[PDB]
Each structure stands twice: as structure tokens, then as C-alpha cells.
């Protein structure tokens with residue numbers, strides 16, 4: 001857990017750099033951070049982000065996923081995963097055409113998170129703007145630091161503030 | 169033709185830089201250290217990396233051939249950009265082992281006026297050889313081009 005604590009320290013430095021510049025202070029561009037307290041070389045404790053859910057859990061959940069709820073007629077997450085794993089030992093062109101075929105039968109439904117959670121148009125607009133700003137700032141910081149392994153289970157979204165939180 | 173040649177050359181140069189980049193060497197050294205359950209995954213990586221290398225080499229060869237062809241067409245289609253004969257010769261000399269490049273040079277470069285090759289005649293002459301002469305060999309094509317230039321402008 002020491003690597004996570006160091007990454008949190010760098011995120012705090014990025015937040016402080018963004019705070020002292022008026023262009024980003026006006027836009028409230030910040031990185032969500034959680035306290036990590038290493039205890040040994042093998043065990044440790046860290047902050048649990050209350051009120052946050054994984055984006056993969058919200059989107060491609062088998063039981064009550066967003067894709068299943070909003071697009072029942074489209075391909076399921078398991079079907080797309082199996083199709084992608086099948087073309088793993090194949091040509092690059094076959095991989096590209098499989099990916100395009102999957103994307104054709106898999107339409108994004110993530111825009112409904114703010115619609116179903118913030119019925120007020122003013123609050124919905126504020127949450128969407130905060131989400132877009134958080135995504136842009138986190139993406140730029142991750143590119144600068146070369147952050148990797150940003151899969152669905154490594155990204156958390158706050159239910160109250162609609163701000164992305166990066167873990168692992 | 170010049171714009172397409174420049175774009176193809178840029179892509180080929182980027183691919184060549186990626187091949188010679190320190191990141192590629194580090195990845196290869198990591199794979200070599202890893203190869204020294206565990207067997208299945210070792211041979212899986214030693215096959216996936218070879219497949220990726222073959223695909224990258226094929227893409228590099230395609231970009232190189234397209235760049236050489238477009239440079240030849242640009243040289244044959246005007247005289248304003250005669251300075252790019254240096255780039256065409258640099259690609260030809262650095263990729264003399266490719267049969268397609270040598271065949272394209274033999275088929276189309278002989279139509280190019282010889283006076284465009286005059287400034288780099290020293291470098292053309294310094295590459296003369298005999299060990300790899302043949303119908304599609306680089307040495308025979310270079311010798312024929314040099315002889316034709318000498319016949320046109322002996323002085």
C-alpha cells in the first residue's frame with residue numbers, strides 16, 4: 001500500500017498546483033483523493049470512499065446493469081466479453097472487425113446516471129459539468145504521470161457529487 | 169505526390185524510431201528475463217510478441233514502399249522539389265535488402281532525369297559493389313543508374 005500512498009501524495013501536489021492557478025481554480029479542477037496508511041510490507045489500511053460505486057458495477061452488472069436495463073435487445077456484457085476473448089488469438093484485422101461489431105450492438109447508456117439521480121435540471125447540469133471537469137482533469141493527470149490499468153473496477157464514481165475517483 | 173510521400177515517410181520514421189526506442193529494448197529484455205503454467209504463458213508471450221513484431225515489420229515495409237513510390241512519382245512529376253532525391257536515396261540505401269524497393273527503383277527511377285542525382289554523385293559512387301549483383305539486386309541497379317548518369321553528364 002505504500003505505492004498507493006505515494007500516488008495519493010502526488011495527486012495532492014497536482015491538486016495544490018491546480019488550486020493556485022486562477023484558470024483551474026475558477027473551474028474547480030481537482031483530483032479526488034483518499035487517505036492510505038500503510039502498516040507493514042504486506043498489510044495496510046486505507047480510506048473507503050463512502051457513497052461511491054464502481055463504474056463497471058453500475059454499467060455492466062449482470063443482474064441490474066445499466067446496459068441491461070436500458071438496452072435489453074443489445075448484446076449482453078458476457079456475450080461481448082466472450083466474443084473479445086475468442087478473437088484474442090487471431091489477426092489484428094479480425095480483432096478490429098470484432099471490436100467494431102461489438103460496438104455496433106453495444107450502445108453507451110452512461111448518460112442516464114445523472115438523469116436518474118438528479119431530476120432537477122439545475123442540479124443535473126451542475127453534476128454533469130462537475131463530472132466532465134473531473135474526467136478531463138483526471139485524464140490529464142493520469143497521462144502526465146503515465147497512469148495505467150484504468151479498467152472499470154479501478155474507477156469509482158461518487159453518487160452525491162458525480163466525481164470520478166481513481167483507485168489501484 | 170510530395171504530400172503523400174512526406175506522410176508515408178513520417179509514418180515509417182515513427183515506426184523505425186519505435187523499433188529503436190529504449191522502450192522496445194526494455195520490453196524485449198523483460199520478456200527474455202521472464203522466459204528464463206509458467207511454460208504455457210512463456211510460450212504464449214514468445215508467440216504473441218513475434219506476431220506483433222511480424223505485423224509491425226509488415227506495416228513498416230508497406231509504408232516504406234509507399235513512401236519510395238510516392239517520392240519517385242513526385243520527382244517525375246516536377247522539378248520544384250528536387251531536393252527530396254536525397255531522401256529517396258537515403259531510403260534506398262538504408263533499405264537495399266528489400267526486393268520491392270529495388271524493383272521499384274529499377275522500373276521507375278531510370279525515367280528520372282540524371283541531373284537530379286548529380287549533387288549526391290559522391291554518395292552514389294561510394295556504394296558501388298559486386299557481391300550482390302543480379303536481376304533485382306541493388307548493386308546492378310545502382311551500377312546501371314550510375315552509368316546512365318555518367319553517359320548523360322560525363323563532365
Ligand SMILES: Nc1ncnc2c1ncn2[C@@H]1O[C@H](COP(=O)(O)OP(=O)(O)NP(=O)(O)O)[C@@H](O)[C@H]1O
Pocket residue numbers: 034046047048049050052054153154156167168
Ligand atoms: N478506497 C476504496 N474506496 C472504496 N471502494 C474501494 C476502495 N478500494 C477498493 N474498493 C472496492 O474494492 C473493489 C476491489 O478493488 P481492490 O480492493 O483494489 O481489489 P483488487 O481488485 O483485487 N486489486 P489488487 O489487490 O490490486 O489486485 C473495487 O471494485 C471497489 O469496489
Ligand SMILES: [Mg+2]
Pocket residue numbers: 153154168
Ligand atoms: Mg482493482
